Amino acid sequence: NEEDDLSVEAEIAHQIAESFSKKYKFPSRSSGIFLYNFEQLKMNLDDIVKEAKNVPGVTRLAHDGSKLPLRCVLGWVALANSKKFQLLVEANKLNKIMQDDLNRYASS
C-alpha cells in the first residue's frame, strides 16, 4: 500500500514533469482559444501532483502505469487553483472537454 502510493506519486510526477511546459488549448470566454501549461500555474510540482490526484480517475490510471489525460489534468488543476485561468476560460465548454477526455481515458 505504501509502495503503491510511492509508485503512483512517481508516475504522476513523471508525466507532469515531462509535459510541464507543453502548451495546451483551452476555450476562451469571448471567442477562440488560449494556451496554458503547467509552468504557468506558478505552483510547485509537489502541490501540482497532489492536486492531480483530486482529478477523478487519475490515481487509477497512474496506479496502472497508463498515460494520463494531461490536457484535462491541467485544466482541472488550473480551474481549481489559478484565478487567471478561471477568468479566461469558458467553463461550460471546459467541463464538457474534461469529461470527454476522462471518458476516453477510462476505456479499456
Give the burial string for 27-55 (b: 16+ CB within 10 Å, else e).
beeeeeebebebeebebeeeebbebbeeb
This entry's atomic model was obtained through X-ray
The total number of structural domains in the chain stands at 1
Look-up of cell digits 478561471: 86
| Final resolution, Å | 1.5
Look-up of cell digits 474534461: 98
Distance CA 100, CA 9 (A): 25
Secondary structure letter of residue 31 according to DSSP: S
**Contact status, residue 53 vs residue 12, Cβ threshold 8 Å:** yes
